[PDB]
Structure formats: structure tokens, C-alpha cells
Design a protein around this ligand. Structure first.
Ligand SMILES: *[C@@H]1O[C@H](CO)[C@@H](O[C@@H]2O[C@H](CO)[C@@H](O)[C@H](O)[C@H]2NC(C)=O)[C@H](O)[C@H]1NC(C)=O
Ligand SMILES: *[C@@H]1O[C@H](CO)[C@@H](O[C@@H]2O[C@H](CO)[C@@H](O)[C@H](O)[C@H]2NC(C)=O)[C@H](O)[C@H]1NC(C)=O
Ligand SMILES: *[C@@H]1O[C@H](CO)[C@@H](O[C@@H]2O[C@H](CO)[C@@H](O)[C@H](O)[C@H]2NC(C)=O)[C@H](O)[C@H]1NC(C)=O
Ligand SMILES: *[C@@H]1O[C@H](CO)[C@@H](O[C@@H]2O[C@H](CO)[C@@H](O)[C@H](O)[C@H]2NC(C)=O)[C@H](O)[C@H]1NC(C)=O
Ligand SMILES: *[C@@H]1O[C@H](CO)[C@@H](O[C@@H]2O[C@H](CO)[C@@H](O)[C@H](O)[C@H]2NC(C)=O)[C@H](O)[C@H]1NC(C)=O
Ligand SMILES: *[C@@H]1O[C@H](CO)[C@@H](O[C@@H]2O[C@H](CO)[C@@H](O)[C@H](O)[C@H]2NC(C)=O)[C@H](O)[C@H]1NC(C)=O
Ligand SMILES: CCCCCCCC/C=C\CCCCCCCC(=O)O
Ligand SMILES: *[C@@H]1O[C@H](CO)[C@@H](O)[C@H](O)[C@H]1NC(C)=O
Ligand SMILES: *[C@@H]1O[C@H](CO)[C@@H](O)[C@H](O)[C@H]1NC(C)=O
Ligand SMILES: *[C@@H]1O[C@H](CO)[C@@H](O)[C@H](O)[C@H]1NC(C)=O
Ligand SMILES: *[C@@H]1O[C@H](CO)[C@@H](O)[C@H](O)[C@H]1NC(C)=O
Lengths: 147, 343, 184, 196, 49
């Protein structure tokens, strides 16, 4: 009766038969099924490396069979730039990623803005261009004390 | 069910649709109007007489044979031979109006079209009068017009021998009744052969009942188009709410979900608008069938070409799926001969 | 649920589909995910929405009573508690899911209305030849609607009936002619 | 009795009241849909124009414009469909007036159940009421009947009426009222011999 | 000419929605006019017979 009153939007109902809006079921539960993976992702080899490549000849690395627990970076890494495209940063903990590739290089600081979809400039034009429909994340950090 | 069609078990989508809630109350109001209108159409066409006259036990109509058009008890349904040929011609989308959850359970859901409609909130409601009740109404109309002529439509049914009623109707078209009394035998045999030819034409051709099948096909196609339009992106990153809600946070998510809500709400609005226009055309056809039921089953019409080509004698209603079939018996003049005249 | 990152809500059942090894999800014509492969155990599972089945509430005026009868089209009665997930439901919706006034119509399972053997004119049309009404201790009854009075014509090949009197009847017919003219 | 039934029951004029109610409800729904956000930050233009600058404002205002324009489009579409149904009803009331008020209609059930004698128009709000006066036969009686009558080896058929017998004597009567008369060469016409 | 394909698709989808709604309004009003013409053609057919 209350469901009917709710659908009708009044406190009185006339004689008749009424369709109802399914307010009866509330899920009240949660299921998580993820693949059985134990290895941590190679955050050390990718982010903590002696040598990065030049931007003109940039390095691509395949990432597979690993758990992307990026909170392991909280202790050591500090990123001036971290922008994700096609995904929200707060959702990264809850997803399984199909084809993870890591492109890495070193550029000037003034050119970090150029690594983004639809940019122009010496980097985006002649060295490294991102597709317009790019899905993924761009991470950058100053390495003046290393490089 | 708007919430189920637009949002499909997503609470976040439901909370977003609460902004557009008036539109769904409006849509369901319109659809309910159409449904009660369909039942009123069937009422207005078939429930004209509220006495259920039973067929006479012994059939002595003067050589006229109504066995094909009168109900036969051996079959469980009280349906005529012709009514069965008619129900076999029109093929419906689904029969029963009860598809259980245990039936749609499994991969049968994806395979079946009706299951896919039901899982997105599109329900087909059963009509109020079953086919058996409509068959009883049509049998009442036959037994009343056969035994009482047109009198049962105007008041109490007054019995009259069928040949005398045919003589009345021959008077009705400008032929003296002696013509029928002198050609009773021929006329009855010509009638009988005409009924047999009707039956044969129905049992042979499969596309005779084109209009009813067209109505059924249009409704089924409208529902299937409504289901297919759930694959549209409408400018969102995806057409699946679960993908958007998996990838984006609630602030980045609401731009996409509001795009999907606007598009799916416009899909339902287009469906309801085209159903209101089709229901207005069906209602015009049901008003015409109610006028041919009153004016040519319950009487003899003088309107030219209203009931058959020729001089109308009588008509017999048969129930078809979602429709009605009139068997118009007319007198067509023949074997003309030249003569010389004067005022 | 959350299967390999795909979140959602529904009922999980075992599936007959067979995915090629490079496939993980399956979709409908509406493009929604209807089959998935479980990551821990590679078994195909079907995902079915939880809300399902049309539901109608039959009421007399709330001015008259607060009894209601509920019609579940597309569920037989044996399957009413399963179809609406009666256990998740409140106790009230549970007395309605089972009760004792369970009547199986061709339109669906009607719960909360008493089935009678009589026939009356339709009061609240339920469907498939069934109507409901509030009748007497008052309760909601469900019955097969009456088409009218059973009658017979005393036909024979030499009998006629001639009226010896008449009535002058005056009846009313109401027709709408115009509607309100509006401007925006 | 018409007057008494009208003065007693309040829901007699259901169709006209339904038209009025539908129009009023359409307008009220149109007014209520001004509270919809349509995806904007607010449903009030003054709030948006108070909080946001004109570049951040035009995204929201264009959302409100699209939604409110779609509300008016839906209202006008449903008014065109209701006006087409009212126009069909007004065309029927026109024919009924000409055919029944201005003439006698032989169409069965066009104007009341029975045989139509006369009709009388009354004006109702937004509508018309026809008071149809019809003739309904009553108090039927059984008789034995026959198609024709042999007199001198010739068939005699009734000019108008039916041959009826009260058990012993044969008469010819009109069809809708019992008025037996002696069978005569005025009441009947002759056509051929008896055997046919 | 002015915008790249990511900045372009927001505008083009706005134009698509609006022009599609223009065609939808045209077709709806043609269905209502065709229903009125069909009622007039049914009247002309009866008048002819
Ligand atoms: C009315 O026509 C039917 C045929 O459509 C006649 O039925 C046949 O009758 C013969 C002998 O009486 C049977 O051998 C056939 O099997 C019947 N066929 C069917 C389809 O029923 C019927 O007899 C006719 N009516 C009368 C009174 O004779
Ligand atoms: C009525 O008479 C007309 C004219 O006498 C007939 O018409 C002609 O018949 C001839 C054959 O004898 C045809 O070749 C012509 O085409 C007919 N028409 C005309 C205009 O000449 C007509 O056939 C006669 N009808 C009957 C039933 O006898
Ligand atoms: C509710 O379930 C019963 C149990 O099967 C259904 O009963 C059967 O109907 C089929 C044909 O539809 C018959 O072949 C069976 O013999 C019936 N079994 C019994 C025990 O009656 C019943 O039809 C279902 N309800 C409805 C409305 O169909
Ligand atoms: C025909 O029917 C009318 C009523 O429809 C009869 O008129 C009534 O007759 C009874 C007794 O005969 C009176 O008590 C009523 O007051 C009469 N009504 C009116 C309005 O006058 C009429 O008598 C019947 N005629 C025949 C021949 O039976
Ligand atoms: C006309 O005659 C028929 C049959 O003689 C009458 O019908 C029967 O009348 C008896 C009562 O005498 C009823 O029990 C039956 O139900 C009637 N029908 C049949 C088929 O037997 C009928 O009543 C007579 N009508 C008039 C006005 O006298
Ligand atoms: C049928 O009607 C005839 C004529 O009205 C009746 O015949 C007469 O009976 C009356 C007495 O009731 C006499 O006064 C007449 O002189 C008779 N005339 C003739 C020509 O016989 C007849 O009695 C009626 N029969 C029935 C069964 O009602
Ligand atoms: C002297 C000014 C002439 C400008 C003419 C107007 C055309 C404007 C378009 C492009 C010129 C702007 C300079 C581009 C700077 C980008 C260099 C970079 O990304 O690393
Ligand atoms: C983990 O997943 C593997 C499949 O990759 C499965 O064989 C194993 O049984 C799982 N272990 C569990 C569920 O404890
Ligand atoms: C990163 O590399 C430096 C240099 O060896 C090391 O001291 C530090 O612990 C490393 N941190 C991580 C998280 O690997
Ligand atoms: C309707 O309600 C009024 C009071 O609100 C009451 O007096 C009346 O009896 C009620 N009628 C019905 C039919 O419920
Ligand atoms: C109606 O009749 C059936 C037998 O046809 C019987 O089993 C049933 O109990 C009856 N119902 C009532 C309420 O009397």
C-alpha cells in the first residue's frame, strides 16, 4: 500500500489496481572476486631506476601478473604531477587492468605540461605524442638530485 | 518500470533520476490510459448485448447451414471452425502472458527476446476478457441474430423463423419476399457454398489477416527497438552504467550518468508518444467496428458499401486475435437483360 | 558484486555459456554484461537483475479500507517467495508473499484476495477474466467476471413473437465537444 | 426520471469531468517540472546566476533550457493528441446532432437503444448531452406463423406484416405492434402457385 | 576546424542531440497531421460510396 502511495505521490488512493515501482528489495551485501595474484608490481624497477631513457627514444615496459598497490610508493616517492584519463584516481584501488604498459623518460620541467592528449610543442610534436582517446595515467616528478 | 529501464538496479542512478521523476509518473500515467482504453475498446465492440443467448438445440434454419460459424462443443473452447482458422493465422509475439522467473533463469534470458524485455522493466499486461469470453459474446450475437433477427438489438429478443427473417431482409433491399420464398432452396445453397468458399480461402492463404498481424508486428518491433536503444552511448563514455560507476568517481560519474538518463528518458518518451498515436488509430478502428457491430450485425444497413459490396442482407461477427472479422452477406444482382422503357 | 573490477548489483546463477580463452565478459543486445567468468574458479556465471516481475496493488478506496491484494504477474505461486526474494523482504511483504489467500490466475499469482465461486459484474479489473471487489466483516474478493444473464430464444420454424405494448424510453448521451484553450 | 437521476448521482457526467481534470493536471505537471534540476547545480536560475560567472553559468543554464524546452514540447505533443481525440468526439457530436436532432435516424444504436423517434440537445460544460427518445417494444406474445397462404392454388404474401394465428383464425399484423386484421386482397398480394 | 576531436565531440554531441530532436519533432507533428488527413480521407471515402 505504501509503495502504491509512493508511486502515486499522494496519501490517498482511489479504488483500482496500480503498478508499483519495486521499492521492496535492498541489496545489503557485497561480493569481491579478483584473480589470485600474489606478486607486487615492479614499482621499484619502473619508478626507482638508476637510468631513464631520453624522450626521443623512450622506453616501453610490459606489466603483467601483479598487484598495483601504489601505497608502497607513499614512503619514497613524491610526484608533482599525477593525472589520470578515462579513470578516476580514487577508483584505481578497485580495478583489474588488462594491458598495462609503462612508457618512461626524462624531459625538462617546463615540458611536463606537454605530455597530455591534444597538446602541441617540441615534445608533443617531435618526441612523444599521446593519442587523443588516451586511457591511463601520467606521473611526473622532479629528479634534479638524480639526473 | 522507469527506474528499472533507465537505472536497472543502480541506487546512484535512481538518486539521479529523482530529479526527473515527474516525467516517469507522466509516462506511466499515459501507458495506463492506453491500457484501460484497450479494454474499453474490446468492451465497446463485443459487449453490446448483455444477454448471453444460447444457440438453439436443433438447427432448422430452412436449409441455411451455420455449422462453420456456430460454436462447437467438442473443442474445449466454444469457438467456431472459422474462428479457429482465424486464430491459427495470426501469430502473436508470446502466448500465455506468464513467463516465470524460473523460465527466464539462465542463459535463456539473453537468448529470448521477451526475457530481455522483462529484465528491463517492459511488461505486457494480459487483456481483461479472455478469448473464451469474447467467443461467448460472439456466439451470443450469432444466436440472437439467427433466432431473433434484429429485434434483440432493440429490446427483448423476439423469435422468428429464419426464412421469414430473410424475407424481411429481402424487403429491406427492394425485392419482394415472394422472390426468396420461391428461391429458398437456391439461396440457401448459394449461401452455403459462399461460406464454404470463405472457409477454403481462409484455410489456404496465410496472409489473409494482414491488418491484425501488422498491429502485432508493430507493437513487438516498438518494444524491441526500446530494448536495443539501451546500447546507445548518448555521448557517455560507455552505455553500461556499471562501467561508468566502476571507472569514475561520483563527480566525474554524474556527467555521464546524466547523459545516459537524458537519452534513455527520451527513448521512453518517444515510445510512449508513438503508442499514443497508435492507440488513437486503433481506437478509431474500434469505434468503426462498434458501429459495424451495431449497425450491421444488430440490424440491416442501407448505407452503400458500408457492409460489403452489394445490397446488404446481414452480417456475422467472428472473433479474431486482437480484432474482429465480419462476414457480410449481400445480394449482388446478376444476369442482366436489355429492355425498352418509358416514364 | 565486483568481478575483476566490474561492479554491479544482481543475483548470481551458474551459466551454460562457453567463452573462448581470450574472452572474459559477455553482453546482450542492450550491451549490458550478462555473463562473467569467475576469476578464482573459471566457471561461467549468469548475472540476473533482482527486481523482476510486474506487481500491481488492488485497493478499494483508502477512504474505505487499508486492505490490499497484490498481483504478481509472471510468477506462479510456488515460486512467489523465490521470485521477489521474500527472505530479504520485510515481514509484511512476507505475509503477502505467502499468506493463505493465494490464488493462481492466468495473469499471475494473486495474494490477499479471497476467491469466490460466484460471478458478478467487474468492479476492479484484474485481468484474464478476473475482477476484484470489496465485499462482505469486509474483505477483498476475486472472481470471474460475469458476461451477462444467460438467456435462450424459443426458436422454432413456425413460431413468432409480436410485441403487444411498448415503452417510450429517454436516454442520455454525453459527448465532449471542446477542451480548454491554453497559451504559453 | 432523467431529471431525478441527474439530481441524485454526482458522477453522471464522467466524460466532461475527465476532460477538465486531464487539462488541469497537464498544466499542474508543467508547473511542477520547473523544480527539476535536469543535471544543473540548481533548478533556480537566480541561484545559478548568483553563484557562477557567465562562462561557468552557461553550461548550467543551457541544461535548464534544454530540459524546460523538452517539458513544453511534451506538453504540446500531448495536447495535440488530446485535441485530436476531442475533435473526433466533436465530429461525432456534429453528426449526431444533424442525424438525430434534425432528422430521424435509421442507423441501429446510433441514437439510443431501440427505434429512434426524436432527440433533444442540451448544452453541458465543454460538451453536449443528447436526450434520445426511442420506442422500445414490450410485452411480446407467441403466435404461430406462416410465410404465405394458399387460397385458390395461389400463394398470397402479406403486403406489410406477418401472418399470425391466435390458434384457430389467421390474421395479418404489423411487425412491431400486435394489430390483427382479417386477411384480404388488400392486405396481401398473390404470386404464383402453392407448391414452391 | 577549431577544436581537436576530444574538445570537438562535446560540441558535436550537442549539435547531434539538438538536430535529432528537431527531426523527432517534425516526425511527431507529421504523424499527427497524417492522422487528421487520414480521418478526412476516411470521410471522403464514405461520402463517395
Ligand atoms: C453443414 O455443413 C457441414 C460441412 O461443412 C456438414 O457436415 C458434414 O456432414 C456429413 C454428413 O452429415 C459428414 O459426413 C461430414 O463429416 C460433415 N463435415 C463436417 C466438417 O462437419 C453438415 O452436415 C451441414 N449441416 C447439415 C445440417 O447438414
Ligand atoms: C444492350 O444493348 C446494347 C446495345 O444494343 C448492347 O451493347 C452492344 O452489344 C454488342 C454485341 O451485340 C457489343 O459488341 C457492344 O459493345 C455493346 N455495346 C454497345 C455500346 O454497342 C448490350 O450488350 C446489350 N446488353 C444485353 C445484356 O443484351
Ligand atoms: C502453476 O504451476 C502448475 C504446476 O505445473 C501448472 O500446472 C500445469 O499446467 C500445464 C500446462 O500449462 C499442465 O500440462 C499440467 O498438467 C499442469 N499441472 C498441474 C499440477 O495443474 C500451472 O499451469 C501453473 N499456473 C498457471 C497459471 O499456468
Ligand atoms: C401498456 O403498457 C403501459 C405501461 O407501459 C400500461 O399503462 C399502465 O397500465 C397500468 C395498468 O394497466 C396502470 O397501473 C399504469 O398507471 C399505466 N401507466 C400509464 C403511464 O398510464 C398500459 O395499460 C399497457 N397497455 C396494455 C394494452 O396492456
Ligand atoms: C413462447 O413459447 C415458448 C415455448 O413454448 C416459451 O418458452 C418456454 O416457456 C416455459 C414456461 O411455460 C419456460 O419454462 C421455458 O424456459 C420457455 N422456453 C423454452 C425454450 O421452453 C416462451 O415462454 C413463450 N413466450 C411467451 C411470451 O409466451
Ligand atoms: C382468435 O380470434 C378470433 C377472432 O377474434 C376468435 O373468434 C371468435 O370468438 C369470439 C369469442 O371469443 C366470438 O365472439 C366471435 O364471434 C368468434 N368469431 C369467429 C370468426 O370465430 C377466436 O375465438 C380466437 N381464438 C383464440 C384461441 O383466442
Ligand atoms: C608574434 C606573434 C605571432 C602570433 C600569431 C597568432 C597565431 C597564434 C598561434 C600560435 C602562436 C603562439 C606561439 C606558440 C607557443 C607554443 C610553443 C610550445 O608549445 O613550446
Ligand atoms: C587461486 O586461484 C587459482 C587459479 O588461478 C586456483 O586454482 C586456486 O584454487 C585459488 N586459491 C584459492 C581460492 O584459495
Ligand atoms: C629507491 O632507491 C633508493 C636508492 O637505492 C633507495 O635508497 C630507496 O630505498 C628506494 N625506495 C624504494 C621504495 O624502492
Ligand atoms: C469518504 O470519506 C469521508 C470522510 O473523509 C467519509 O465520511 C465517507 O463515508 C467516505 N466514503 C467512502 C465511500 O469511503
Ligand atoms: C467452488 O467449487 C469448487 C468445485 O468446482 C470447490 O472445490 C470449491 O471449494 C468451491 N469454492 C467455494 C469458495 O465454495
Amino acid at each position: 500500500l505504501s509503495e502504491t502511495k509512493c508511486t502515486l505521490k499522494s496519501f490517498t488512493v482511489e479504488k483500482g489496481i496500480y503498478q508499483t515501482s519495486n521499492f521492496r528489495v535492498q541489496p545489503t551485501e557485497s561480493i569481491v572476486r579478483f584473480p589470485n595474484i600474489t606478486n607486487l608490481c615492479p614499482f621499484g624497477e619502473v619508478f626507482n631506476a638508476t637510468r631513464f631513457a631520453s624522450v626521443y627514444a623512450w622506453n616501453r615496459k610490459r606489466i603483467s601478473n601483479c598487484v598495483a598497490d601504489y601505497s608502497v610508493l607513499y614512503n619514497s616517492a613524491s610526484f608533482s604531477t599525477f593525472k589520470c584519463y578515462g579513470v578516476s584516481p580514487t577508483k584505481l584501488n578497485d580495478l583489474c587492468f588488462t594491458n598495462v604498459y609503462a612508457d618512461s623518460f626524462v624531459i625538462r620541467g617546463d615540458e611536463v605540461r606537454q605530455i597530455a592528449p591534444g597538446q602541441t610543442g617540441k615534445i608533443a610534436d617531435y618526441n612523444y605524442k599521446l593519442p587523443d582517446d588516451f586511457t591511463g595515467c601520467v606521473i611526473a616528478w622532479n629528479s634534479n638530485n638524480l639526473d | 518500470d522507469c527506474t528499472m529501464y533507465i537505472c536497472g538496479d543502480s541506487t546512484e542512478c535512481s538518486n539521479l533520476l529523482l530529479q526527473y521523476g515527474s516525467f516517469c509518473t507522466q509516462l506511466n500515467r499515459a501507458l495506463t490510459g492506453i491500457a484501460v482504453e484497450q479494454d474499453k475498446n474490446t468492451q465497446e465492440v463485443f459487449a453490446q448485448v448483455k444477454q448471453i443467448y444460447k444457440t438453439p438445440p436443433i438447427k432448422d434454419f430452412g436449409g441455411f447451414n451455420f455449422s462453420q460459424i456456430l460454436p462447437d462443443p467438442s473443442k474445449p473452447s466454444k469457438r467456431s471452425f472459422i474462428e479457429d482458422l482465424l486464430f491459427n493465422k495470426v501469430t502473436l509475439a508470446d502466448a500465455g502472458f506468464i513467463k516465470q522467473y524460473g523460465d527466464c533463469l539462465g542463459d535463456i534470458a539473453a537468448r529470448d527476446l521477451i526475457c530481455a524485455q522483462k529484465f528491463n522493466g517492459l511488461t505486457v499486461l494480459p487483456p481483461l476478457l479472455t478469448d473464451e469470453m469474447i467467443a461467448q459474446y460472439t456466439s451470443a450475437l450469432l444466436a440472437g441474430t439467427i433466432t431473433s433477427g434484429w429485434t434483440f438489438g432493440a429490446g427483448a429478443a423476439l423469435q422468428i423463423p429464419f426464412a421469414m427473417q430473410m424475407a424481411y431482409r429481402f424487403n429491406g433491399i427492394g425485392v419482394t419476399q415472394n422472390v426468396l420464398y420461391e428461391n429458398q432452396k437456391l439461396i440457401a445453397n448459394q449461401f452455403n457454398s459462399a461460406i464454404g468458399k470463405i472457409q477454403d480461402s481462409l484455410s489456404s492463404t496465410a496472409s489473409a489477416l494482414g491488418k491484425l498481424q501488422d498491429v502485432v508486428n508493430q507493437n513487438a518491433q516498438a518494444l524491441n527497438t526500446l530494448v536495443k536503444q539501451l546500447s546507445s552511448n548518448f555521448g557517455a563514455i560507455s552505455s553500461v552504467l556499471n562501467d561508468i560507476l566502476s571507472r569514475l568517481d561520483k563527480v566525474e560519474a554524474e556527467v555521464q550518468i546524466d547523459r545516459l538518463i537524458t537519452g534513455r528518458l527520451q527513448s521512453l518518451q518517444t515510445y510512449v508518444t508513438q503508442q499514443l498515436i497508435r492507440a488513437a488509430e486503433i481506437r478509431a478502428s474500434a469505434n468503426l467496428a462498434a458501429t459495424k457491430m451495431s449497425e450491421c450485425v444488430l440490424g440491416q444497413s442501407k448505407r452503400v458499401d458500408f457492409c460489403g459490396k452489394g445490397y446488404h442482407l446481414m452480417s456475422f461477427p467472428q472473433s479474431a486475435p486482437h480484432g474482429v472479422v465480419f462476414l457480410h452477406v449481400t445480394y449482388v444482382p446478376a444476369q442482366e437483360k436489355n429492355f425498352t422503357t418509358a416514364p | 558484486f565486483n568481478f575483476n573490477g566490474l561492479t554491479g548489483t544482481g543475483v548470481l546463477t551458474e551459466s551454460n555459456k562457453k567463452f573462448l580463452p581470450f574472452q572474459q565478459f559477455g553482453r546482450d543486445i542492450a550491451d549490458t554484461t550478462d555473463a562473467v567468468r569467475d576469476p578464482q574458479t573459471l566457471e561461467i556465471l549468469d548475472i540476473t537483475p533482482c527486481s523482476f516481475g510486474g506487481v500491481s496493488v488492488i485497493t478499494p478506496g483508502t477512504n474505505t479500507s487499508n486492505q490490499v491484494a497484490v498481483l504478481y504477474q509472471d510468477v506462479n505461486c510456488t515460486e512467489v517467495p523465490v521470485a521477489i526474494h521474500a527472505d530479504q523482504l520485510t515481514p509484511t511483504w512476507r505475509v503477502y508473499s505467502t499468506g493463505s489467500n493465494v490464488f493462481q490466475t492466468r495473469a499471475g499469482c494473486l495474494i490477499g484476495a479471497e476467491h469466490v465461486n460466484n460471478s458478478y459484474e467487474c468492479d476492479i479489473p484484474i485481468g484474464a477474466g478476473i475482477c476484484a471487489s470489496y465485499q462482505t466483516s469486509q474483505s477483498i474478493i476475486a472472481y470471474t467476471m460475469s458476461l451477462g444473464a444467460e438467456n435462450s430464444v424459443a426458436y422454432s420454424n413456425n413460431s413468432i413473437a409480436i410485441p403487444t405494448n411498448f415503452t417510450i424510453s429517454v436516454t442520455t448521451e454525453i459527448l465532449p465537444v471542446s477542451m480548454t484553450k491554453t497559451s504559453v | 426520471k432523467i431529471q431525478d437521476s441527474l439530481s441524485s448521482t454526482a458522477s453522471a457526467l464522467g466524460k466532461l469531468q475527465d476532460v477538465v481534470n486531464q487539462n488541469a493536471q497537464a498544466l499542474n505537471t508543467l508547473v511542477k517540472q520547473l523544480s527539476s534540476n535536469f543535471g544543473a547545480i540548481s533548478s533556480v536560475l537566480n541561484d545559478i546566476l548568483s553563484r557562477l560567472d557567465k562562462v561557468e553559468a552557461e553550461v548550467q543554464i543551457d541544461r535548464l533550457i534544454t530540459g524546460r524546452l523538452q517539458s513544453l514540447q511534451t506538453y504540446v505533443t500531448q495536447q495535440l493528441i488530446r485535441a485530436a481525440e476531442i475533435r473526433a468526439s466533436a465530429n461525432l457530436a456534429a453528426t449526431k446532432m444533424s442525424e438525430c436532432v434534425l432528422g430521424q435516424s435509421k442507423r441501429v444504436d446510433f441514437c439510443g437503444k431501440g427505434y429512434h423517434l426524436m432527440s433533444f440537445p442540451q448544452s453541458a460544460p465543454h460538451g453536449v448531452v443528447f436526450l434520445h427518445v426511442t420506442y422500445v417494444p414490450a410485452q411480446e406474445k407467441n403466435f404461430t406463423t406462416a410465410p404465405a397462404i394458399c387460397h385458390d392454388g395461389k400463394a398470397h404474401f402479406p403486403r406489410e406484416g406477418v401472418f399470425v394465428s391466435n390458434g384457430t383464425h389467421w390474421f395479418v399484423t404489423q411487425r412491431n405492434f400486435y394489430e390483427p386484421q382479417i386477411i384480404t386482397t388488400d392486405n396481401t398480394f398473390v404470386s404464383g402457385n402453392c407448391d414452391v
